[PDB]
Amino acid sequence: GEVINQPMMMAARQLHDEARKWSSKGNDIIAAAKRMALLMAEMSRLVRGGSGTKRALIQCAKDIAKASDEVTRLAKEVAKQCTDKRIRTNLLQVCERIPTISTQLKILSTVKATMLGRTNISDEESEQATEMLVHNAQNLMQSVKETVREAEAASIKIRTDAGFTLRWVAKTPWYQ
C-alpha cells in the first residue's frame, strides 16, 4: 500500500504547521518553508522505493537544498537590517547551520538512493543509511522552523524604518 517514513513525515508536517500560521504574501521565507515541508513529505514517500525512485530521491534532496539556500539567504538579509543584538545573533546562528545540514542531506539522500532495490547491501547498512537520513531531515526541519520564528521577531525591530521587510500576517487560528 502506502508505506512512508513516519519520522520524516512527522517532521515535515510540523515544519508545515509552523509555516501555515503565516500568509506567504510578502514573505518569501514563509513560502520557501511551505515548499520545504512539501518536498520533505515527498521524500518520506521515496525512502521506500525501488531502483526507479533513485533519481527521484536525489532530485528531491536537491530541490530541498535549493529551498534551504533561499531561506538562509533571506534570513541573512533580514539579520543585516536587524537592530536587535540578541535576535540578530540568533538569526545569524541558523544561517550558518542550515547550509551544513542541507549539504549533508544531499550526501545522505544519495547514499540511500544507491541502496534502493539493491539486494547486495546489508540489512543493517541500509537501515543505518535511513536513520542517518531521517536524523538529518529532522535537524533541517527544526532549523527552518527556528529560522521562521527568529525572523518574525526580527521584524519587530527594523533598521532605518527603510529597506527590506518581510510581511508577517497571520492566517486566522481556529481552535481544534
Part in contact with ligand PIO (CB under 6 A); list of ranges 22-30, 70-78, 129-137, 144-152: 22-30
**Helices 123-153 and 28-46, axial angle in degrees (round to 10):** 170
| 24 binding partner (options a copy of itself, ligand PIO, none; Cβ < 5 to 8 Å by kind) | ligand PIO
Closest Cα partner for 126 from 136, 137, 116? Answer: 116
Closest Cα partner for 28 from 171, 163, 172, 165? Answer: 165
C-alpha dihedral sign at 10, 15, 17, 20 = negative
Please give the residues from 21 up to 60 whose contact with a copy of itself meets the rule CB under 8 A.
Answer: 38, 41
Please give the residues from 39 up to 98 whose contact with ligand PIO meets the rule CB under 6 A.
Answer: 51
CA distance 175 to 95: 33
Cβ closest to ligand PIO, residue 162 vs residue 170: 170
Reduce the DSSP state of residue 170 to 3 states and report it.
strand
Q: Least distance to ligand PIO from the beta carbon of 131, Å?
A: 23
Cβ closest to ligand PIO, residue 1 vs residue 52: 52
Part in contact with ligand PIO (CB under 6 A); list of ranges 18-26, 82-90, 102-110, 156-164: 18-26
CA distance 27 to 165: 9
Q: Least distance to ligand PIO from the beta carbon of 23, Å?
A: 6
Breaks in the chain after residues (C–N exceeding 2.5 Å): none
Cβ closest to ligand PIO, residue 64 vs residue 82: 64
Which parts of this chain interact with ligand PIO (CB under 6 A)? 23-25, 34, 51
